[PDB]
């Protein structure tokens, strides 16, 4: 038995022994990939004929054996077992594949639960619930033999034009980092042999493209880059031990991220100590030539990406095959190939693949997690406006109007399988239609709740056709209340309004949906506006014309029930905005953590034509009950530069309905050596409060958490005063106080705390 085959040997011994046995061809094969669909016949069965050509020298990864094959979970598990058996038994060294899938909103394949989108996850402000979600996703994935999920997205979004806003955790580096760490911890667990490699993406800056345009330059200066864009990745690497990173398609200031050694190696590996694998975004190596025009051919693109620190070319070997030629021709050192192969082999050993690369097909039946999906949907929906119309009485006659009340397809996000796969489509068409039919609808939910309603489509999500307006207006006039359900169709194709590749310059609700809302409102009937969307839209032309507004970030299969639960008060809405809502596209960007000079035009404050304040601020979300904050304690009042302050507030549900509050901690600083945000989120806690219940929320805030970059790009804590602002949104501050850092300016070196510890205690009798 060779040392690499021997599970009694330490991982590093097995890696070194295996690498010493490998040919250059076998090494380069470990840095590439093949699509699952390239390995199947016409009946979705493993094809030995196709494997003999593609797998003969081994392979790094199989790309989406479930997601790219339209196989049911047991069929996908059988495919993955036959691929692994071919590699284990019919290649010289018997190295198994790593399998990856998309899993942002759950495993992206037939049979997997459609969880609410990432921006909905962030709107829960409940990191533990997201960890519970990805712990369930972990088991779904391991059942089909998948080792790696291409999630989560840690791109910080302040530009709602961008079609991938829905895949983010929003604008706050703090909230994004906290949701990201929980997401990763759920997927991976402690021993990765029993878990799924998380893939934080898209490193880094990809959410800040010129004009909000997909793949366009992300031109971010250094302190902003470190504190806003890199921070959540840094937390995922150092605190959550994330085992994969995927690069950004964008350039930063002239340098494509896929060709940037200073990013993918010097920051991620050298500064931060990342020991996992870097996987390319799909085709990101090839497009160094085709798109960015900095590589003259596929071999130059391969060299740039390997020097940068990409270990695996996804989704299929294309440039990385030329790494063999580059070594043979004495252009690159085989030592640089060895470095990448060592990272891939180490992770394959840690996943236990050399001990057991197979799964039990009899167990590959994925369980529904509708329960978890519903908890997220119920906690994620945000009450943006309520003049008192909500919650509705069940005896009111409803006119249910709008395309997103009537089309279950429009509840789906861009990485939910039945929306995403439409890009390929452009026997399979009938399979999609059949699975679509099983998703419970908004109509179904109103019917189950026993509401007397009539439905009018009103208009499509896209186009200019107003011929359905008259029917909607007529049912509105015959009803007590109009529930107008409008928003997006998310995906990758031209008929989609949001999603990857679907950027919206002017932030108007798609098609004639705004005009539909305004025509319904002209009847004089009460109007509840339900936004089923992937991005903030400009609501300035409808906000004062409607009685209530619910923001329902693309909720997946649990959406209908959660919406109707909230409308009728069976659930007390508790979501809070994780991203600011601009008044208009021309106001972009708006975000809560502006510097003193940000968020305003000096010296009149506003634009000529527009307020500089967002229409709804970060952290905004109303309730059917009232929360009363009291008894701010901050101890001690003077803390040294690596000390800790404990901030406590009492929160009482003083209303008549049980409900959750998301208590938010904002920290402000002035008279630093650099300008600082006037307020920035640095802690939060979702707290359940029965009617008349009072609890204490405690924030344990280490000074490490407040560190920022000074004039000389050093991470510091400087003596001075920090303002403490606790409240129900970034604007709805309820209690304010301060503490001082006392002592010598501190350079924060090495490992440091990222997060405030947030918990609940009994309030005093």
- Give the single-character DSSP code of 118: H
**Minimum distance of a second copy from residue 404's CB (angstroms):** 16
Sketch the per residue contact string, 502 through 541, with a second copy: x for CB under 8 A, - otherwise: xxxxxxx-x-------------------------------
**CB closer to a second copy out of 268 and 687:** 268
666 has which bridge partners?
Answer: 681, 725
**CB closer to a second copy out of 506 and 688:** 506
Q: Does 557 bind ligand IVG (CB under 6 A)?
A: no
**Minimum distance of ligand IVG from residue 416's CB (angstroms):** 12
How far, in Å, are 404, 517, 545, 643, 735 from residue 522 at the CA level?
A: 21, 9, 8, 59, 41
**CB closer to a second copy out of 587 and 625:** 587
Respond yes or no on whether the N-terminal peptide bond of residue 411 is cis (omega within 30° of 0): no
- Looking only at residues 59 through 88 of this chain, which bind ligand IVG when binding is defined by CB under 6 A? none
Q: Rounded CA gap, 125 and 578, in Å?
A: 8
- Looking only at residues 609 through 628 of this chain, which bind a second copy when binding is defined by CB under 8 A? 609-610, 612
Q: Rounded CA gap, 266 and 574, in Å?
A: 42
**CB closer to a second copy out of 655 and 720:** 720
Closest Cα to residue 461, out of 383, 406, 536?
406
**Minimum distance of ligand IVG from residue 420's CB (angstroms):** 6
**SS3 (DSSP) at 440:** coil
Burial track 124-160 (b if 16+ CB lie within 10 A, e otherwise): bbbbebbbbbbbbbbebbbbbbbbbbbbbbbbbbbbb
Among 252, 285, 549, 558, binds a second copy (CB under 8 A): 252
Q: Rounded CA gap, 137 and 144, in Å?
A: 11
- Looking only at residues 613 through 672 of this chain, which bind ligand IVG when binding is defined by CB under 6 A? none
Among the residue ranges 37-45, 350-358, 467-475, 584-592, the one whose residues contact a second copy (CB under 8 A)? 584-592
Q: Does 201 bind ligand IVG (CB under 6 A)?
A: yes
φ and ψ of 474, to 5 deg? -65, -45
| Alpha helix (H) residue ranges in 427-523 | 428-437, 442-448, 469-477, 513-522
Q: Are strands 148-149 and 746-747 parallel, antiparallel or unpaired?
A: unpaired
Q: Rounded CA gap, 140 and 444, in Å?
A: 27
Q: Are 162 and 209 in contact (CB under 8 A)?
A: yes
Q: Rounded CA gap, 592 and 608, in Å?
A: 22
Residue 150's binding partner among a second copy, ligand IVG, none (Cβ under 5 to 8 angstroms by kind) is: ligand IVG
For the purposes of burial, counting CB atoms within 10 Å of the CB of 338, is it exposed (0-12), middle (13-18) or buried (19 or more)? middle
Among 220, 377, 432, 472, binds a second copy (CB under 8 A): 220
Among the residue ranges 142-150, 414-422, 563-571, 585-593, the one whose residues contact a second copy (CB under 8 A)? 585-593
**Minimum distance of a second copy from residue 7's CB (angstroms):** 44
Residue 729's binding partner among ligand IVG, a second copy, none (Cβ under 5 to 8 angstroms by kind) is: none
431: number of Cβ within 10 Å:
14
- Looking only at residues 142 through 161 of this chain, which bind ligand IVG when binding is defined by CB under 6 A? 150
Among 24, 93, 255, 742, binds a second copy (CB under 8 A): 255
- Give the single-character DSSP code of 377: H
Among the residue ranges 260-268, 277-285, 550-558, 631-639, the one whose residues contact ligand IVG (CB under 6 A)? 277-285
Q: Rounded CA gap, 293 and 316, in Å?
A: 21
User: What is the per-residue DSSP string for 163-231?
Assistant: TTGGGS--S-HHHHHHHHHHHHHHHH-SSGGGS-EEEEEEETTTTS-GGG-TT------HHHIIIIIIH
Residue 101's binding partner among ligand IVG, a second copy, none (Cβ under 5 to 8 angstroms by kind) is: none
How many amino acids of this chain bind ligand IVG (CB under 6 A)?
A: 9
Q: Does 317 bind a second copy (CB under 8 A)?
A: no
**CB closer to a second copy out of 316 and 435:** 316
Among 272, 282, 358, 607, binds a second copy (CB under 8 A): 607
Closest Cα to residue 60, out of 23, 24, 6, 100?
100
How many amino acids of this chain bind a second copy (CB under 8 A)?
A: 79
**Minimum distance of ligand IVG from residue 244's CB (angstroms):** 11
Among 254, 273, 463, 636, binds a second copy (CB under 8 A): 254
Q: Does 494 bind a second copy (CB under 8 A)?
A: yes
Residue carrying the six token digits 């038995």: 1
Among the residue ranges 52-60, 233-241, 276-284, 508-516, the one whose residues contact ligand IVG (CB under 6 A)? 276-284
Q: Does 500 bind ligand IVG (CB under 6 A)?
A: yes
Distance of CA 612 to the CA centre of its chain: 27
Among the residue ranges 133-141, 275-283, 391-399, 634-642, the one whose residues contact ligand IVG (CB under 6 A)? 275-283
Q: Does 595 bind a second copy (CB under 8 A)?
A: yes
**CB closer to ligand IVG out of 501 and 541:** 501
Q: Does 350 bind ligand IVG (CB under 6 A)?
A: no
Residue 696's binding partner among ligand IVG, a second copy, none (Cβ under 5 to 8 angstroms by kind) is: none
Among the residue ranges 28-36, 280-288, 401-409, 536-544, the one whose residues contact ligand IVG (CB under 6 A)? 280-288
Sketch the per residue contact string, 407 through 446, with ligand IVG: x for CB under 6 A, - otherwise: ----------------x-----------------------
270: tokens are 């050298």
Residue 281's binding partner among a second copy, ligand IVG, none (Cβ under 5 to 8 angstroms by kind) is: ligand IVG
- The sign of the torsion formed by the CA atoms of 289, 290, 292, 293 equals positive
Residue 213's binding partner among ligand IVG, a second copy, none (Cβ under 5 to 8 angstroms by kind) is: a second copy
Count of CA atoms in the C-beta half-sphere (13 A) of 75: 17
Backbone conformation region of residue 58, classed left if phi is above 0, alpha if psi is from -120 to 50, else beta? left
Closest Cα to residue 453, out of 443, 462, 461?
443
**CB closer to a second copy out of 445 and 579:** 579
Q: Rounded CA gap, 198 and 245, in Å?
A: 8
Q: Does 131 bind ligand IVG (CB under 6 A)?
A: no
Residue 589's binding partner among ligand IVG, a second copy, none (Cβ under 5 to 8 angstroms by kind) is: a second copy
Q: Does 596 bind a second copy (CB under 8 A)?
A: yes
**Minimum distance of ligand IVG from residue 174's CB (angstroms):** 23
- Looking only at residues 292 through 311 of this chain, which bind a second copy when binding is defined by CB under 8 A? 292-296
Closest Cα to residue 130, out of 198, 183, 189, 187?
183
Residue 652's binding partner among ligand IVG, a second copy, none (Cβ under 5 to 8 angstroms by kind) is: none
Cβ neighbours for 79, distance < 8 A, ≥ 6 positions apart:
36, 39, 40, 44, 45, 46, 65, 69, 71
Among 223, 261, 282, 370, binds ligand IVG (CB under 6 A): 282
Residue 423's binding partner among a second copy, ligand IVG, none (Cβ under 5 to 8 angstroms by kind) is: ligand IVG
- Looking only at residues 709 through 728 of this chain, which bind a second copy when binding is defined by CB under 8 A? 709, 711
Among 38, 78, 166, 281, binds ligand IVG (CB under 6 A): 281
Count of CA atoms in the C-beta half-sphere (13 A) of 533: 29
Q: Rounded CA gap, 634 and 181, in Å?
A: 27
Among 16, 132, 213, 370, binds a second copy (CB under 8 A): 213
Residue 683's binding partner among ligand IVG, a second copy, none (Cβ under 5 to 8 angstroms by kind) is: none
| Alpha helix (H) residue ranges in 478-558 | 513-522
Q: Rounded CA gap, 629 and 612, in Å?
A: 28
Q: Does 250 bind a second copy (CB under 8 A)?
A: yes
Where do contacts with ligand IVG occur on this chain (CB under 6 A)? 102, 150, 201, 281-283, 423, 492, 500
């Amino acid at each position: 038995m060779e040392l690499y085959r021997d599970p009694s040997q330490p991982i590093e011994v097995r890696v070194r022994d295996l690498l010493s046995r490998m040919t250059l061809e076998e090494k380069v094969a470990q840095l590439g990939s093949v699509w699952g669909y390239e390995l199947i016949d016409e009946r979705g069965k493993f094809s030995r004929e196709k494997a003999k050509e593609l797998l003969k020298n081994g392979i790094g990864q199989i790309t989406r054996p479930g997601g790219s094959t339209n196989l049911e979970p047991q069929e996908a598990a059988e495919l993955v077992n036959e691929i692994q058996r071919f590699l284990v038994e019919e290649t010289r060294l018997g190295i198994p594949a790593m399998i990856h899938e998309e899993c942002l909103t759950g495993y992206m394949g037939l049979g997997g639960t459609n969880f609410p989108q990432a921006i909905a996850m962030a709107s829960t402000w409940d990191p533990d619930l997201i960890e519970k979600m990805t712990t369930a996703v972990r088991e779904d994935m391991r059942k089909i033999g998948a080792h790696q999920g291409l999630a989560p997205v840690l791109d910080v979004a302040r530009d709602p034009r961008w079609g991938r806003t829905e895949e983010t955790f929003g604008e706050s580096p703090y909230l994004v980092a906290r949701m990201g760490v929980s997401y990763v911890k759920g997927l991976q667990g402690e021993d990765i042999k029993k878990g799924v490699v998380a893939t934080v993406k898209h490193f880094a800056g990809y959410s800040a493209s010129e004009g909000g345009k997909n793949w366009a330059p992300t031109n971010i200066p250094e302190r902003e880059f470190k504190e806003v864009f890199l921070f959540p990745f840094e937390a995922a690497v150092k605190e959550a031990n994330v085992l994969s990173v995927m690069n950004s398609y964008s350039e930063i200031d002239g340098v494509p991220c896929a060709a940037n050694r200073k990013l993918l190696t010097d920051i991620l590996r050298k500064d931060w100590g990342f020991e996992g694998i870097v996987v390319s975004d799909y085709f990101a190596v090839k497009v160094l030539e085709d798109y960015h025009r900095i590589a003259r051919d596929k071999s130059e693109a391969a060299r740039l990406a390997l020097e940068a620190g990409i270990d695996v070319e996804l989704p299929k070997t294309e440039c990385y095959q030329y790494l063999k030629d580059l070594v043979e021709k004495g252009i690159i050192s085989e030592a640089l190939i060895d470095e990448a192969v060592t990272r891939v082999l180490r992770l394959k050993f840690m996943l236990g693949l050399f001990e057991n690369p197979y799964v039990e097909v009899e167990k590959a039946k994925i369980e529904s997690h509708r329960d978890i999906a519903l908890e997220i949907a119920r906690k994620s929906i945000i009450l943006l406006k309520n003049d008192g119309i909500l919650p509705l009485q069940k005896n009111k006659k409803v006119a249910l109007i709008g395309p997103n009340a009537g089309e279950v397809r429009n509840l789906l996000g861009d990485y939910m399988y039945l929306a995403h796969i439409r890009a390929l489509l452009d026997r399979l068409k009938k399979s999609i239609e059949e699975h679509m039919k099983s998703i419970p609808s908004v109509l179904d939910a109103f019917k189950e709740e026993g509401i007397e309603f009539e439905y009018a489509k009103g208009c499509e999500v896209t186009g200019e056709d107003r011929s359905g307006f008259e029917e909607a207006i007529e049912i509105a006039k015959k009803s007590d209340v109009a529930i107008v359900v409008v928003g997006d169709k998310s995906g990758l194709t031209l008929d989609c309004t949001t999603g990857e590749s679907r950027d919206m310059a002017n932030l108007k609700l798609p098609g004639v949906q705004e005009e539909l809302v305004l025509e319904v409102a002209k009847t004089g009937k009460p109007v509840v506006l339900v936004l089923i969307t992937g991005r903030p839209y400009s609501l300035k032309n409808v906000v004062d014309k409607v009685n209530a507004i619910l923001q329902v970030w693309l909720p997946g299969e649990a959406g209908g029930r959660a919406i109707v639960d909230i409308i009728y008060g069976k659930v007390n809405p508790s979501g809070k905005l994780p991203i600011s809502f601009p008044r208009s596209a021309g106001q972009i960007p708006v975000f809560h953590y502006v510097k003193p000079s940000g968020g305003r035009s000096h010296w009149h404050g506003d634009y000529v034509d527009e307020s500089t304040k967002p229409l709804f601020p970060f952290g905004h979300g109303l309730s059917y009950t009232k929360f009363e904050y009291s008894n701010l304690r901050i101890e001690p009042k003077e803390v040294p530069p690596a000390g800790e302050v404990v901030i406590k507030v009492d929160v009482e549900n003083i209303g008549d309905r049980d409900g959750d509050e998301v208590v938010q901690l904002y920290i402000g600083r002035e008279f630093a050596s650099v300008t600082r945000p006037v307020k920035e989120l640095k802690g939060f806690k979702r707290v359940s409060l029965k009617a008349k219940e009072k609890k204490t929320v405690v924030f344990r805030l280490h000074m490490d958490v407040l560190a920022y970059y000074n004039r000389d790009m050093k991470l510091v804590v400087e003596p001075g005063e920090f303002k403490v602002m606790v409240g129900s949104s970034s604007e709805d501050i309820r209690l304010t106080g301060s503490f001082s850092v006392v002592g010598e300016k501190r350079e924060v070196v090495g490992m440091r705390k990222f997060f405030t510890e947030a918990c609940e205690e009994a309030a005093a009798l």
